[PDB]
Amino acid sequence: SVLYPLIQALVLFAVAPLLSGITRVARARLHNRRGPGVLQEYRDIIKLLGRQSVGPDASGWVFRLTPYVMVGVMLTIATALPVVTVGSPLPQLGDLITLLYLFAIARFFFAISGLDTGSPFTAIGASREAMLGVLVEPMLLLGLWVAAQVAGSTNISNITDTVYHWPLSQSIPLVLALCACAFATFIEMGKLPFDLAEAEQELQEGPLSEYSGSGFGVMKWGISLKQLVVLQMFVGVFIPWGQMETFTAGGLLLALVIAIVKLVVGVLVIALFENSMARLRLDITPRITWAGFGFAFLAFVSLLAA
Amino acid sequence: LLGPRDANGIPVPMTVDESIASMKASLLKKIKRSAYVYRVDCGGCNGCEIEIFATLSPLFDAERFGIKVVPSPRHADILLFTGAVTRAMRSPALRAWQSAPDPKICISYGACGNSGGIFHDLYCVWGGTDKIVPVDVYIPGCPPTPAATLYGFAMALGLLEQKIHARGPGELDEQPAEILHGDMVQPLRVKVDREARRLAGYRYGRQIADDYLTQLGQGEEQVARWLEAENDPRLNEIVSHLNHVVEEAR
Amino acid sequence: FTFIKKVIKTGTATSSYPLEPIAVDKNFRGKPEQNPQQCIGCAACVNACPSNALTVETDLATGELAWEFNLGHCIFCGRCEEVCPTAAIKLSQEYELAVWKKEDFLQQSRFALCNCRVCNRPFAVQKEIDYAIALLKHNGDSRAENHRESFETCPECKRQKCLV
Amino acid sequence: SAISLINSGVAWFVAAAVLAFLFSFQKALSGWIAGIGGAVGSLYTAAAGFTVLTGAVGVSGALSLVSYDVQISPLNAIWLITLGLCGLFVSLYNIDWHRHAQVKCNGLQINMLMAAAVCAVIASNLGMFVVMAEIMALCAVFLTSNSKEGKLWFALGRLGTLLLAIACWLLWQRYGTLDLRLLDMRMQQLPLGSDIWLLGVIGFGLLAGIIPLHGWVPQAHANASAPAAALFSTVVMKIGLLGILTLSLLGGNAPLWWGIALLVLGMITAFVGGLYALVEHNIQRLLAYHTLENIGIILLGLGAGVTGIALEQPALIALGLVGGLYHLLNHSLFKSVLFLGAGSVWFRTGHRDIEKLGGIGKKMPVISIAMLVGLMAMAALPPLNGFAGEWVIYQSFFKLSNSGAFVARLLGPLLAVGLAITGALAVMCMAKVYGVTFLGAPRTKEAENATCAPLLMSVSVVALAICCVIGGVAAPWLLPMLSAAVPLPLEPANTTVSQPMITLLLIACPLLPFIIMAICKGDRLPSRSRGAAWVCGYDHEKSMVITAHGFAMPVKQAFAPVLKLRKWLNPVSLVPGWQCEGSALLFRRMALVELAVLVVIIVS
Amino acid sequence: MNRFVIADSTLCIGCHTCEAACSETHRQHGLQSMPRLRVMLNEKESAPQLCHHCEDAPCAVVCPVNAITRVDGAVQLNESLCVSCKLCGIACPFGAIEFSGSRPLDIPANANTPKAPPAPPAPARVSTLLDWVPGIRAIAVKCDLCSFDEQGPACVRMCPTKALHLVDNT
Amino acid sequence: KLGQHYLAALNEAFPGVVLDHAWQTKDQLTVTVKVNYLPEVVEFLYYKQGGWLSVLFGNDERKLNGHYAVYYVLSMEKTKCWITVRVEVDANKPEYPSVTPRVPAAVWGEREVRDMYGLIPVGLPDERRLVLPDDWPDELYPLRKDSMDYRQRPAPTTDAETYEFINELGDKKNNVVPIGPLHVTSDEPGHFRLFVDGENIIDADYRLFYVHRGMEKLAETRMGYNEVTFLSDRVCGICGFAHSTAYTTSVENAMGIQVPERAQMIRAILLEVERLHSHLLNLGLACHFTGFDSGFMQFFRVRETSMKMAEILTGARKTYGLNLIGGIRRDLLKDDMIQTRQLAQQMRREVQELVDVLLSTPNMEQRTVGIGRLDPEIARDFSNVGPMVRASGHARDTRADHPFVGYGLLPMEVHSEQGCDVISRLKVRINEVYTALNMIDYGLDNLPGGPLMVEGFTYIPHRFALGFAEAPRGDDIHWSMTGDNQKLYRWRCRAATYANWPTLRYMLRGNTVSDAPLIIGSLDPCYSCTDR
Numbered sequence A: 001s002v003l004y005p006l007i008q009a010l011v012l013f014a015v016a017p018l019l020s021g022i023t024r025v026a027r028a029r030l031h032n033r034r035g036p037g038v039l040q041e042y043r044d045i046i047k048l049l050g051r052q053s054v055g056p057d058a059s060g061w062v063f064r065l066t067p068y069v070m071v072g073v074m075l076t077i078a079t080a081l082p083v084v085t086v087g088s089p090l091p092q093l094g095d096l097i098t099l100l101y102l103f104a105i106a107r108f109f110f111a112i113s114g115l116d117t118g119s120p121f122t123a124i125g126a127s128r129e130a131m132l133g134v135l136v137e138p139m140l141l142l143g144l145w146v147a148a149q150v151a152g153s154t155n156i157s158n159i160t161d162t163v164y165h166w167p168l169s170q171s172i173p174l175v176l177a178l179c180a181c182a183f184a185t186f187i188e189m190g191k192l193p194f195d196l197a198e199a200e201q202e203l204q205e206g207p208l209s210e211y212s213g214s215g216f217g218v219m220k221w222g223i224s225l226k227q228l229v230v231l232q233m234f235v236g237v238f239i240p241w242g243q244m245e246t247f248t249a250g251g252l253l254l255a256l257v258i259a260i261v262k263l264v265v266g267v268l269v270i271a272l273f274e275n276s277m278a279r280l281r282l283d284i285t286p287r288i289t290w291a292g293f294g295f296a297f298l299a300f301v302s303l304l305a306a
Numbered sequence B: 001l002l003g004p005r006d007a008n009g010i011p012v013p014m015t016v017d018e019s020i021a022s023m024k025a026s027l028l029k030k031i032k033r034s035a036y037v038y039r040v041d042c043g044g045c046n047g048c049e050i051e052i053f054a055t056l057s058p059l060f061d062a063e064r065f066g067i068k069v070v071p072s073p074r075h076a077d078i079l080l081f082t083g084a085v086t087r088a089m090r091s092p093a094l095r096a097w098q099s100a101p102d103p104k105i106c107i108s109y110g111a112c113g114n115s116g117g118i119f120h121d122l123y124c125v126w127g128g129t130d131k132i133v134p135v136d137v138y139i140p141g142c143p144p145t146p147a148a149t150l151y152g153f154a155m156a157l158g159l160l161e162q163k164i165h166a167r168g169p170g171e172l173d174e175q176p177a178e179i180l181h182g183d184m185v186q187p188l189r190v191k192v193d194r195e196a197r198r199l200a201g202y203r204y205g206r207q208i209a210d211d212y213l214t215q216l217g218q219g220e221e222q223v224a225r226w227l228e229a230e231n232d233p234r235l236n237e238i239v240s241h242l243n244h245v246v247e248e249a250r
Numbered sequence C: 001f002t003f004i005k006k007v008i009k010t011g012t013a014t015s016s017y018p019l020e021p022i023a024v025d026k027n028f029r030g031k032p033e034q035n036p037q038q039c040i041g042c043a044a045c046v047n048a049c050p051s052n053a054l055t056v057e058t059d060l061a062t063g064e065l066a067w068e069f070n071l072g073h074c075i076f077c078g079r080c081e082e083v084c085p086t087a088a089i090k091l092s093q094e095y096e097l098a099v100w101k102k103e104d105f106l107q108q109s110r111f112a113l114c115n116c117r118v119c120n121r122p123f124a125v126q127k128e129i130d131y132a133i134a135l136l137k138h139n140g141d142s143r144a145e146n147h148r149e150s151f152e153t154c155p156e157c158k159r160q161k162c163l164v
Numbered sequence D: 001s002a003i004s005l006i007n008s009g010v011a012w013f014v015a016a017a018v019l020a021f022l023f024s025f026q027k028a029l030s031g032w033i034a035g036i037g038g039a040v041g042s043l044y045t046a047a048a049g050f051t052v053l054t055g056a057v058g059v060s061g062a063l064s065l066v067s068y069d070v071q072i073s074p075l076n077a078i079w080l081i082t083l084g085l086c087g088l089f090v091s092l093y094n095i096d097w098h099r100h101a102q103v104k105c106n107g108l109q110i111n112m113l114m115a116a117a118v119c120a121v122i123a124s125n126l127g128m129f130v131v132m133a134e135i136m137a138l139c140a141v142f143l144t145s146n147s148k149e150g151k152l153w154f155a156l157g158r159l160g161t162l163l164l165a166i167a168c169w170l171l172w173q174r175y176g177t178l179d180l181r182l183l184d185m186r187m188q189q190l191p192l193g194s195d196i197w198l199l200g201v202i203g204f205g206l207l208a209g210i211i212p213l214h215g216w217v218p219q220a221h222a223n224a225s226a227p228a229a230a231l232f233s234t235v236v237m238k239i240g241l242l243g244i245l246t247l248s249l250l251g252g253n254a255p256l257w258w259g260i261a262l263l264v265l266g267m268i269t270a271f272v273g274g275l276y277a278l279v280e281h282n283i284q285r286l287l288a289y290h291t292l293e294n295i296g297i298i299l300l301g302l303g304a305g306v307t308g309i310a311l312e313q314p315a316l317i318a319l320g321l322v323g324g325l326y327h328l329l330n331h332s333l334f335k336s337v338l339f340l341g342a343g344s345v346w347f348r349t350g351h352r353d354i355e356k357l358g359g360i361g362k363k364m365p366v367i368s369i370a371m372l373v374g375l376m377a378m379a380a381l382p383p384l385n386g387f388a389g390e391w392v393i394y395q396s397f398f399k400l401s402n403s404g405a406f407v408a409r410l411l412g413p414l415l416a417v418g419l420a421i422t423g424a425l426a427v428m429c430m431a432k433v434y435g436v437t438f439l440g441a442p443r444t445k446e447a448e449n450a451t452c453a454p455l456l457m458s459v460s461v462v463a464l465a466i467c468c469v470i471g472g473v474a475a476p477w478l479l480p481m482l483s484a485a486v487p488l489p490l491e492p493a494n495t496t497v498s499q500p501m502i503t504l505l506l507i508a509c510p511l512l513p514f515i516i517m518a519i520c521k522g523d524r525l526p527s528r529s530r531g532a533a534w535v536c537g538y539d540h541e542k543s544m545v546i547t548a549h550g551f552a553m554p555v556k557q558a559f560a561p562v563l564k565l566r567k568w569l570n571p572v573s574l575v576p577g578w579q580c581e582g583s584a585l586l587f588r589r590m591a592l593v594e595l596a597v598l599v600v601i602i603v604s
Numbered sequence E: 001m002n003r004f005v006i007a008d009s010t011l012c013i014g015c016h017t018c019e020a021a022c023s024e025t026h027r028q029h030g031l032q033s034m035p036r037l038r039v040m041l042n043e044k045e046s047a048p049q050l051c052h053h054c055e056d057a058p059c060a061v062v063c064p065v066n067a068i069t070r071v072d073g074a075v076q077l078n079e080s081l082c083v084s085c086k087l088c089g090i091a092c093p094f095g096a097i098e099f100s101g102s103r104p105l106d107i108p109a110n111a112n113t114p115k116a117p118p119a120p121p122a123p124a125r126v127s128t129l130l131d132w133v134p135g136i137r138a139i140a141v142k143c144d145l146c147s148f149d150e151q152g153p154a155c156v157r158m159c160p161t162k163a164l165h166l167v168d169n170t
Numbered sequence F: 001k002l003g004q005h006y007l008a009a010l011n012e013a014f015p016g017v018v019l020d021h022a023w024q025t026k027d028q029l030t031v032t033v034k035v036n037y038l039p040e041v042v043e044f045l046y047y048k049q050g051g052w053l054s055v056l057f058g059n060d061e062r063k064l065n066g067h068y069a070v071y072y073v074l075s076m077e078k079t080k081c082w083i084t085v086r087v088e089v090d091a092n093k094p095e096y097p098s099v100t101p102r103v104p105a106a107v108w109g110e111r112e113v114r115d116m117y118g119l120i121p122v123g124l125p126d127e128r129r130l131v132l133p134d135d136w137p138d139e140l141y142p143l144r145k146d147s148m149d150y151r152q153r154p155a156p157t158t159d160a161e162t163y164e165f166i167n168e169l170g171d172k173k174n175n176v177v178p179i180g181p182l183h184v185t186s187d188e189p190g191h192f193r194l195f196v197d198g199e200n201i202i203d204a205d206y207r208l209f210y211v212h213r214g215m216e217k218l219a220e221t222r223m224g225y226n227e228v229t230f231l232s233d234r235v236c237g238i239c240g241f242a243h244s245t246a247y248t249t250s251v252e253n254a255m256g257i258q259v260p261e262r263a264q265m266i267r268a269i270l271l272e273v274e275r276l277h278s279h280l281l282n283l284g285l286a287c288h289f290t291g292f293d294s295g296f297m298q299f300f301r302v303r304e305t306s307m308k309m310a311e312i313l314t315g316a317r318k319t320y321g322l323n324l325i326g327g328i329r330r331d332l333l334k335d336d337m338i339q340t341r342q343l344a345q346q347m348r349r350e351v352q353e354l355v356d357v358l359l360s361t362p363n364m365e366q367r368t369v370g371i372g373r374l375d376p377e378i379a380r381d382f383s384n385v386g387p388m389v390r391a392s393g394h395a396r397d398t399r400a401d402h403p404f405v406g407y408g409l410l411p412m413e414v415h416s417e418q419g420c421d422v423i424s425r426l427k428v429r430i431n432e433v434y435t436a437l438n439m440i441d442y443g444l445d446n447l448p449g450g451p452l453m454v455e456g457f458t459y460i461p462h463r464f465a466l467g468f469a470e471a472p473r474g475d476d477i478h479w480s481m482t483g484d485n486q487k488l489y490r491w492r493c494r495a496a497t498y499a500n501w502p503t504l505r506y507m508l509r510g511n512t513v514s515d516a517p518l519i520i521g522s523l524d525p526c527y528s529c530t531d532r
């Protein structure tokens, strides 16, 4: 019980840079190119870990400490996520408020690293990171809230169990909250058209511009793990039927197979969406984000009606 | 000062300390399957820059070799330098060199980058990338083809070996030159070659005049059967003018 | 999505270079090959080079003309092939020309100079004089068949013979 | 007994104020006397609060100093713990705050504020609570920088007593008493009218800073001294919340619209304060708007408790009235952290503008770490003490959502959505504040030549931040100790949070990428901090550093009507004599006449 | 059957007026301003030597671009067609062809400013059949009989001793 | 003789101001006016006669007539011809009145003649150094014939940039966002100062001429006439043949050289092959700057068809090396005709499918519509050229207004729009792809016969004319003066973005930082063309 949650944390960190490989392979296939292998992101992180980490002279411990802080925050979120079981491995970290404020820790640390270097591109990307985080929280909370109301509990285990033993009568609020949480998952994964902070072609991928070497490698690893845990929060809660209610050693293999297939299909559909359009701007993003808050409010109204 | 200068104030190439430069072999080994390339246009005409873009094309795809073009010099393993290093581009190129992790691989790309190219001695340039920074790999071309860029990248990463080599003075230097088309009158060959360059240009004119005089050394029926095989009306136009020149010579 | 049909309809356009060669046109302007036997050291290509990839240096101490081609200078225009009298230099279709050492760009030749019969000063390439003698022998010339020492005389010394 | 402890605390506060005024010819000695006496009186106040909270029963008595009846309920013991734990380190800070050449003596004002605050907490009569709240409010408005910054506080702060005096006269007429014990017994048959409750809530929110009665707060905090601004944000604005919670919880019988009005007003205060903070460059005005945001979160908790009382749902009462009070105490802790640390930055630099205050984290590192702890504590990031009370208010919001009352089911998810917006705006604001102050290059020569803070300043800020970490990490143990004030079981809806698991998992989990970078570090050359940031090969000018103005322009674009509501709703042109030349000065003169006559009549 | 200018040594005094006059009329026309008749001096007499305009014309035999033709009984070298192969200077038995190219127009020989370190000097001249300067395209320079000029050969007109005259054998 | 009526109107308005007039081509007229009536004459021909300022430049003619010469080339576009207004400036006092207070298009050549020649336009509002770098020494003018040697490299006076930037609409409370010289979108070095309030561009100044090598000095010192044809191919690797053709048909226009009819059409065909790759490079980069990297990949996959056509037709992919003076260097035999005809029809069906996946791109409409607006009367005053002014409603094009090479024998269609934003500049370029494919398809079917060059001609010294090619980004005006039979006297090159850059400031105002690389890309900037 002190090993499942950590074994899950070690398993998700290690594979997080392989889901980035499916993403970069599907990007290459949608660019009509052969592209690299699925291990290119791991090949790029291991190369960067033996590369010198440099920084600006007007930067301190925050710039050096932020990548490890974000990786540790994503590992802390990943121990509480239902992956192969319906319940959370660590249910006392499984409150939706807890898991929403844990993500706010890493957005705060990402934003203070961009203001620590002194670059205009890093600071503007920090400003976009925090503003997208401002814009997406009403929809993500209202979707998770409506699911918790249809589940009698804000714990991720009970929401996952209620989606698992799907209720049918409360199908319309569950489906609309699922759409709101899917859209929120797409925005929190920083996927185009909402890659407004690490927007190469604008900010030289934002706060990542100042990072180099081992710091850049741990930053790329934290970005991949953050994308994995956001997509895992979606697909392990709202599509839980490949998981198992009670842990058995016999049923573990099918659960990991279905979890891996769910993650690969999720990044493939997400790749089909991000490699097919132009990115937005920050002055036009609130209209689209308020529309997802709309799918979530329609969910909230459909619980008050009935 | 961002870069070193001499006693006259003229900039000199930056050296790289022997402790840092002794790690370039290890960096070249570990960037074999994962290379991060930052492009430094130091004053070219954009010709080199857009064949690098065509080396990121779907047809010529460099990412399959693990080559990724990075937004920042901080991410770079390889600093790709194009251009003759203009005076206004010396300081940003040295800033991109200094704001990059050590050790770094420098690829000089293009004739301008290699030696200055056609602007090798102008006032408002410095004469190539080796005049400001040390160079590991030189890729020639004006601009290099994307196939040449792929070959240079694969040779820098160690996937391919260098094929061309230096040719010093030997003994062919004193073996005497042979007369071109020695079975015919040489001023007539000059007139035929000049007429074929007028109508076709230097490249097609030499090919057409050489073939036409080779067929003319055997007979007029040999010329006529060669024109029937090519079945090109423009070549019939050119060979008719060449026949007119040959008839005026007789 | 119209973009997805477009992606599916195209397929993968990536070639297998370096495994399979990439074709260039029969008359693609690649690296200038140079035949040192056919070269007469006339520096016609040197005078027409826009980027000065072709250089000649008169080295009196070695009694030679130092012909050199620098590939790092070359702008691949083909003017050397255009103005070459003996067609010694010609642009190939080779494009795989990257090096580790820029000395490997160099195609060097050294042609022995000809000293004048009268003032014993080096005035021309001996190879170019031999080519001119063979050219005049081909058109039917006795000054070439009997008098090579008139061709190995400098133009100043040939102007001195006309004074008498 | 706790009555003797609170009498010793009041006596030490009064003697500290008197001996700070009489020995004010030497500013260092006056600051030493004021800080020592305030620290001892705050120790007695906190000891009395801990005694009443541990004993789980109300104590009764009277002060030996003047004829003052005293009841200390366990509900007010949290305010006593708040006041003592703030004023201890505020006075220890004040000792070295009096070493600045450009500051003046304030210990008479500070210790009279603390004494009036403590006597307002332990007040028996509601008329006497309205008397000690105004003694505090006068001793607070005399702590402002000049007459111009306390003019609006003298206008709104006396308006609020005219309304409180009307409410107290109305209570006298309807019940024949103003004792809170007797009023509690007399309002089990005849309820408290909503006109009395409306007058009291408006008058107390003119002191607590409920938006839109908040207009004096950023003016008052704008250029005040750091112990004064910390005491404003953590004591004076909390006595108004004590009055609101006193009036709302009399009779155990509340109308439903009381809790609904408290939740809406708390949501308005929380979102408007959190948004208006992100448009401020004076650090103290920003922390004033952030005090207003946290006042709004404490009312979202107290209003959830009052709504649960009205709906007779004890789980909602427990979750709301425990989360609000825990957030109140822990806010006081981290707001004291941030005001004292920002005052230390002003002590070493002379600047309250954070656009002229770059790079203090390398010059004041201990203060930088403690300020980082406080700013992350205010963004409610786990496992710090801001998340502890806000997580419980979200559980109260979930209890509101799954109620039967349609108004509770309508407001429940919407208050959670607004609190998520407020928390995300808070994270953006603290990212801006830590980035443009303690990070990057210095932007003035005063920020370059900043040295470390004085000793007692650093001890006070670090000990307050340590108490913040204790109130965060040990929240699963400190939270059931508030069950003495609210005698109800705490039931989250089939969920729990464990801050010690989050504490151990936010330190052990970052060691794994460090371990793998130490393994995959082959011949990586040591780390480099060499030059300027990358600005695409150009020279880095001071104007390329994006600062607090340009960091919070997207919230000026995407929250345009709420930020424009501060100009449409302003009745500054409708007051006739507001723009007079000597209005602020006349407000100050009749402030000393009113404080003088009030002190004269209350000793009698 | 050929037209040319011949010099008389018993009349020529070696004043080099013809070398300047031939240089000026080609510099105005934009052609090569190197003098096309060169004054040779044995210690006893002197006469400028120039193109004989030969009937067989061995220079026109070896020209690889056919720049050397016969116009109006005169051997005429097209200066714009010459690729500087310098074969005609070897084939000429009278030394009538030397090799000079145009220098930049109206730019002084020492154009170096003191605000910069000076430009690299030119290589030492050995022979016009061997010299090459990077900015200078040294083409074949021979007497073209001043065929562009309406007054005829400028060396004949400006000779003070009348040592030069045309031999119009056509 | 074209322009006789304009000369009569000039002599009617300002009696005696014209001193000497001459025709260099039947559509090229150069008038010599008095030096202190120069701003009135250019303003008269600009606003009363409806001319467009193409290029203004200096010429060190102190060894020709003792005076510096400033030429003012006006494009008569109300048939259409060229008027060059010429003044003589004193060598000891290089002062002449400035035309910039009357014609706003005159701001940059008057800034250029201060740098390269040291002349003083009196009354010029912007005396900032433009062409020379920041480390160049003062009072050292490279285009003067005796000031310096072209091989001399002076020591840098500074390492940090000393250029001053103008923020008109903003204050010092604005931050600056440096786009360039080494940005991701900086394909070629150019620094852009975005005076921003958050992410909103209040005003925009820019530093350029990072790519300036000194090419006009190289063309008159080390190069011959036929070597500048390869030097003009290296002005810009994207429109190098436009510079090569504009240089070649200015020496030929100065000399009256009758180029053969086959060489003119192959020149016209390869100017459209160059147009094919450039507009797809701009369209791919326009997709790239909005985050649509798939559209960048799609447009560069189809761009390789035109690079394959260029390799077949010229022997090189980009630097063609086709033009010599008097003709071209390569013919088109049938495998060249067969393959390029196949590739041109392959290109037409394949570009049409990319426009459909570009106008249906989900956020491409809100990133491009109404963004980077070029005000049409601002575009008239600054004499903007090409797709940037043709989107702004001014349907002016060199291939139609001043027909050159074989463009009188090709199906020309002028493409203009009325919306003045990013999308319409793309829509001009999209429509110009289809027209370029039409002239390639017609040109590959209707080639003339005969020779490819004339040769043996002699250059008459001090003869000059204008050389104009319509480059992909607008008119490319070249001015060559023959020096002798081997070397030039003066070669001036004015490219399209040199006329298009000064209105980028008004286009960047009122937009966002995320829009700013797209607004610059919509100008379709060619930095190496501008800087030379």
Ligand code: SF4
Binding pocket: B043, B044, B045, B046, B047, B048, B049, B082, B083, B109, B110, B111, B112, B113, B117, B141, B142, B143, B144, F234, F237, F319
């Ligand atoms: S090498 Fe050639 S193509 Fe490349 S930048 Fe230089 S001139 Fe342009």
Ligand code: FCO
Binding pocket: F236, F238, F239, F242, F243, F471, F472, F473, F474, F475, F476, F494, F495, F496, F497, F498, F525, F526, F529, F530
């Ligand atoms: N197109 C193009 Fe180049 C530019 N600007 C020119 O002319």
Ligand SMILES: [Fe+3]
Binding pocket: C116, C117, C118, C119, C120, C121, C153, C154, C155, C156, C157
């Ligand atoms: Fe000799």
Ligand code: NI
Binding pocket: F235, F236, F237, F238, F239, F240, F526, F527, F528, F529
């Ligand atoms: Ni261009």
